[PDB]
Amino acid sequence: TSLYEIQMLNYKYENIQLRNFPFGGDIIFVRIIRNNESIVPHGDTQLRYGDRLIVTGAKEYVDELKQELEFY
Amino acid sequence: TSLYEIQMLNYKYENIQLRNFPFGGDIIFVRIIRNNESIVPHGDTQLRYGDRLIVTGAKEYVDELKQELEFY
Ligand SMILES: Nc1ncnc2c1ncn2[C@@H]1O[C@@H]2COP(=O)(O)O[C@H]3[C@@H](O)[C@H](n4cnc5c(N)ncnc54)O[C@@H]3COP(=O)(O)O[C@H]2[C@H]1O
């Protein structure tokens, strides 16, 4: 697996832009699936509750992000 | 999510960082395979001859980039 899906269910990250984001080891956001649309994420893209995040990275770092964003 | 491989075979774009690349369309480089290693691209990553760029985005622009980078 090189593409992982994380659900953004953490209120503390609502409206945060990717350009400010706390990247673990390092990850790329491949797509954000939001309200029937798949968006190509860039610096000014903001997270929203319920986003389906498609990410790529080493599993260790993906795991941290999954924990923080989906499991809190 | 579709990913496409683009060989960086055009010396003209050699050494250009992603932060300066003249993107003409909606795209993200998801990975770059270089020296048999899969790396996670950022602003400071420089294009190198022979890079295998794994990209996602508008197919229209993927085609244009392919023209620019591996037809040249
Ligand atoms: N995988 C990739 N494919 C194509 N181009 C790439 C790229 N990774 C970086 N870049 C290009 O470099 C800028 C610089 O990147 P950086 O990593 O330094 O600085 C970034 C970054 O940490 C954050 N960001 C934007 N998109 C991101 C994404 N998909 N994943 C994670 N962070 C992202 O916003 C900062 C400013 O974003 P902005 O897009 O407005 O500005 C971008 C974009 O034009």
Contact B28 A38 (CB under 8 A): no
β-bridge partners, A6: A53
Q: Name the minimum distance, in Å, from the CA of A33 to any CA of chain B.
A: 10
Strands B52-57 and B27-34: antiparallel
Surface-to-core class of residue A6, CB atoms within 10 Å of its CB (0-12 exposed, 13-18 middle, 19+ buried): buried
> Are B5 and B56 within 8 A, CB to CB?
no
**B42 close to ligand 1 (CB < 6 Angstrom):** yes
Contact A57 B40 (CB under 8 A): yes
Which residues from A are below 8 Å from B when comparing CB atoms?
2-3, 26-31, 38, 40-42, 54, 56-57
Size (chain A), residues: 72
Q: Name the minimum distance, in Å, from the CA of B9 to any CA of chain A.
A: 24
- Technique employed here was X-ray
The phi and psi torsions of A55 (rounded to 5 degrees) equal -125, 160
Considering the domain delimited by B1-72, tell me its CATH architecture: 2-Layer Sandwich (3.30)
Going by C-alpha positions, the residue among A21, B61, A59, A61 that lies closest to residue A51 is A21
Q: Which residue type occupies B45?
A: T
